Amino acid sequence: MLVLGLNGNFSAADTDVVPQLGEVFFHDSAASLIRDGELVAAVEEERLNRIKKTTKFPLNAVRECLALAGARPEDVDAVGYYFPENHIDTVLNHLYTEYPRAPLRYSRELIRQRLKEGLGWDLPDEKLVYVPHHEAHAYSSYLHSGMDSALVLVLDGRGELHSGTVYRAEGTRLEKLADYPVPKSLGGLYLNATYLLGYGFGDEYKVMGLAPWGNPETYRDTFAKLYTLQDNGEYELHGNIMVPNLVSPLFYAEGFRPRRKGEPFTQAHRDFAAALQETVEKIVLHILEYWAKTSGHSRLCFGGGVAHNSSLNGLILKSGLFDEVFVHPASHDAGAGEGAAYAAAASLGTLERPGKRLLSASLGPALGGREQIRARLADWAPLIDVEFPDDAVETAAGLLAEGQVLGWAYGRSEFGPRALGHRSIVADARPEENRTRINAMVKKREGFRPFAPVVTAEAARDYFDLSGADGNHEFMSFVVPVLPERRTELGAVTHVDGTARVQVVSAESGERFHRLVRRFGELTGTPVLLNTSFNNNAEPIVQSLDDVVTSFLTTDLDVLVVEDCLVRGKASPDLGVLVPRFRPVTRLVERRTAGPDASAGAKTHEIHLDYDGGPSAKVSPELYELLGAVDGTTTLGDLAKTVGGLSDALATEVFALWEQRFLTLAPAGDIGPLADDGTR
Amino acid sequence: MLVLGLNGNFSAADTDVVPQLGEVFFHDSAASLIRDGELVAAVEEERLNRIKKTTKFPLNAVRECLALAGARPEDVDAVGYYFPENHIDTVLNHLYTEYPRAPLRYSRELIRQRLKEGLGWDLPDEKLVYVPHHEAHAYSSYLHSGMDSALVLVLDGRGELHSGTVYRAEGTRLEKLADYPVPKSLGGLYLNATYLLGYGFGDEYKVMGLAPWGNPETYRDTFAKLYTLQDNGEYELHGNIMVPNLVSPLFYAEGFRPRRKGEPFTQAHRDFAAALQETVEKIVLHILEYWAKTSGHSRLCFGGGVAHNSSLNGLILKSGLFDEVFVHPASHDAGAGEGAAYAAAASLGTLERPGKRLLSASLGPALGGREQIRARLADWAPLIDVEFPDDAVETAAGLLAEGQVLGWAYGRSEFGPRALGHRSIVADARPEENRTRINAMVKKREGFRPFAPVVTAEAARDYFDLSGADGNHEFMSFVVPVLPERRTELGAVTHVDGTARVQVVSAESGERFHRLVRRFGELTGTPVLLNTSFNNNAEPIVQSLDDVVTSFLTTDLDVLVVEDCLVRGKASPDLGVLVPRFRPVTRLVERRTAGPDASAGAKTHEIHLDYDGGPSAKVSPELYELLGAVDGTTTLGDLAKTVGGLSDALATEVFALWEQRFLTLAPAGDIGPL
Ligand SMILES: Nc1ncnc2c1ncn2[C@@H]1O[C@H](COP(=O)(O)OP(=O)(O)OP(=O)(O)O)[C@@H](O)[C@H]1O
Ligand SMILES: Nc1ncnc2c1ncn2[C@@H]1O[C@H](COP(=O)(O)OP(=O)(O)OP(=O)(O)O)[C@@H](O)[C@H]1O
Ligand SMILES: [Fe+3]
Ligand SMILES: [Fe+3]
């Protein structure tokens, strides 16, 4: 049984199913492949089209998954989609009523069209299975837990009919115990509140990082007007008829000022995040207290997008309601896509399940074989210097010991939002200074948020209070207290309230990364590193070798360790050898607005990315003329000759567009098809 | 005692409060001026910025109203705004959470900023009065009815708290009797369903025009699942949690396919419209049957946007529930703006009301005095020929009897969506072929669309069944049956179901238009004319003289009668003398997307109008370069010199953009102050 799991919307690479399709319309597109009950491959489309949390159809993800499994498309026994057919088709139909130019293509026809055109694959109708959304979440969360039975809680924005579902899991069977309707959504409540902080979809993790700086007392009584806890683990969220936001009218009535772009977080803002986080924690703990007692179960699996609230998970762990708690590395909708594969297998016959608890999220495409990596890094020679140490991990541990900040790229990319030693940025965890230092290097502005530590399994309890239940820490799912006598030692990874979102790495979960952190501890007496995702502010986690080198070159990292090669940026990198390529969403525009006295107004030039929420940037007339000639093969230096040569000013302008990923800049050609390293 | 009524959003001419602000966020912006209880001026901002049902702040409308009243901003005693302050501000606050770059400016500050920067008018806080939305509607509908007591029904999409309100009115006092919550909205229901026919906001009256072509039986049982009538005048609409549309999920599940743009209206689409119309009729008549007998009122005023459903109104008329029914010419939110003025007067003193029932909607700016109109028509000389007949009404009646289709522009423009003899297109009402052609060739719209007749008050009962209650027909508020023995005679203006949305014109409601219809009847035996609004498919009703001439020249009208001047298009009109001007929302774009092998794609050029729902059109590289040099003063002919002269191809390309109103093209100068 080889089963593909799908989630996301149905847009092509260069256009959306309707123009400017909202970023919340079936997001985090991904493809998963299960074989004989095991997750053999999984990657989010965002890693391949470079659009964070993309809604586009995960065609590249499917292609990559088939290649990792050594399968033709025609080898796939079934395809599961993470929503029931009537629901996704009703939402598409609604979009089609709003955009009457859009042809009436529903999900089944669109899935078949994408696979046929993108992969030559004629998908027979009987192989496509649509799945209840919280059922897909529950299979993913529970089947990877290693448990024989468990209480399973799914909380997200919404499935087809519910915002929350409670199951009993035993063997391979799910039994639904309860649900909560869409308007009680805790994901919706949290996203609603996130907007008041000048943030939006996908920034919830920043709001959760801000909450420890706030005093939850200030707005506790205000949030108390928006929910009521009830008997039998029930609750109500009190809506309004004013706007489609649960939170904004009451906070407006009380004088709250929603944060503007570029404005710093006031004390009101920090307090607001603290009270929002406390509110959700109290509601979820109210749910779980009731269902722990009523079901009598001692084990919990927690899935859905809300299960990426690691602060909440830490409190669930500390609550003593359960003996064990498991959280999947991709508990958002990409994991529901994975669960849809299992549900399709169950519906189309018999369900094989994983043999063991999941410990590694390293499931995407790799960087490539040793020989094509060396050759590709040679293509980059005019920008980088490369060394080949005999023991790269030893060298790297030493570099980190000296205080250098490292890019670290090895093997298959992480499924889910956390970097865990395959597409990571690692540094010494002790100096408090590394917080503002590394934010500046990657140009992120989350100095209020600490970094996450990775510690060896052997040393974990010497630094972190894992007490309460036995939770899984291979994926940073849980916030835990840092032992008080260790907080000063771990200055870069300890929050203001003494907690940390810890990864515990073991020889089983990540051999090479474990060896790195252990060796650093042997060298320093502290076997803890900070571990942040390898991406700047304008991209998801890097995927390919070119992605990795690009990100290294456009950030202020000291050195890059990639498949045992040490990469450093040349004193003066030659941008001119890079070949510019449009992304499918890249648009280059000359604009005239209306001027005074009804004249044609100012003539401006701009580059932007054509998707809901995509960035945009002004460009000079000269760079406009240069970029208009991009042909996908001619180098930047040769293109620049048409406008007088690649001056320092033009190169600087191009480099700033490169940092924001408006276009692709890389040496001519590519690394080639990823080698069969014989590890399957 | 002089009071301004305001409605709409707060956006400037060239940008919106937030980018691409939705077309439904406080639309149909307008301004009204009340003096001593009388409505002395009123105009919708759409007529002035040329954006249909615009949401932009009605600055031009306020300026035009003050000019018509002969008043200065300082003379205004109070300003009413047609929604409560907390509600509009909470909506703005919500928009600001979605657009973190927008500064936190709420309605009080925005209204004062617009009036200060736009009119030099420093409005004190104590003169600005915010009004309950359905109260504003009710004042407008009731105070203009001529009645001293009535039941008043307001039905729209929503006010701040309700989708429907029932009032008792006595003297100048309103007392609420009932209201209906927002989820029960009949305006929302109708708009939800309108989207399944490939239409959008503002297209509801086209759905209503489609419905008589359909069989209401086909989808009657489907619609029955979406509402329940309950005892004592109550009802329920049955919502869903799938999408924010009440209608589309159930019809999707039963296999209905929403109409695509540019595709025909099938019999299923017709049947859908028929069942939707029947549904709203059944619910409203249910409400009214209860509240008529419960309140004891023999007279009804009906307002809110749903009261522009002429078919519904005609059924209310025929129901026997009331002896008299009144409907205001602007029953949508522009009329709520007017009622907000009365409500503001009532809160700051006692309330003066109109002395009589409103008979004329001729309330906007006029076209100009005779001298400036003749002078402006001379500026258009390279494009038109002008005659000055001794008796233009006499001449126009003869032209109509000879088969000509006429533009008709006189005096002050109509408040509200209907043309009533001040900004009208008229033709012989007798030949069915006139409907076919004026739909296909003149208005350029769908073949199913009906045309409305105007008839003299003295002949009305010779042609139409007005029986039932006494309704007011001066504003085309009611669909009525055409008498069976007259249906063949009135071929262009009798709908497929034998009805007509009639205007009854009298010497008192419109002396000049009444004279035209009467004379046509004396020449032909039939005192009835086809009367459709004077606008092409890309614009609201024309306002100014330049608007009128532009529309005449870009639609296939035979002759224009404007303030007693007979205008015809020249054999070969010289477009080169016209001076192009950008509209405040006009944008010009050269664009590349990605191309094969991740190249930059080939260049394309577009003109577009930068507002939500604004059109766009491809342009040639040559015209892109030409339009980039527009300065607002240089003629098209001189501009074209930079691209080698106004060729025939360029002039034709420019003509098509003019027709779609992407830019303003008119002779140098303007008509001056009116
Ligand atoms: N750290 C967090 N704390 C609270 N809520 C979060 C957090 N992270 C994500 N969420 C919420 O989870 C929800 C998204 O979860 P999920 O990925 O399972 O998709 P979804 O709600 O089912 O969307 P769709 O309707 O398109 O399927 C959002 O509402 C989001 O605000
Ligand atoms: N012929 C019609 N039949 C039924 N409903 C109509 C018709 N014409 C307009 N409507 C409805 O009237 C409603 C609008 O009425 P109105 O102008 O009074 O504004 P509103 O609902 O108060 O606007 P807002 O969105 O700002 O609250 C819309 O829902 C519209 O669908
Ligand atoms: Fe989900
Ligand atoms: Fe209204």
Author numbering:
A (entry chain B): 1 to 680
B (entry chain A): 1 to 674
From the paper:
Carbamoyltransferases (CTases) catalyze carbamoylation, an important modification for the bioactivity of many secondary metabolites with pharmaceutical applications. GdmN and Asm21 contribute to O-carbamoylation at the C7 (S configuration) of geldanamycin and ansamitocins, respectively. CTases in class III, which modify secondary metabolites, adopt two nucleophilic half-reactions, the formation of carbamoyl-AMP derived from ATP, CP, and Mg2+ and the subsequent transfer of the carbamoyl group from carbamoyl-AMP to the secondary metabolites. GdmN forms a face-to-face homodimer through unusual C-terminal domains, a previously unknown functional form for CTases.
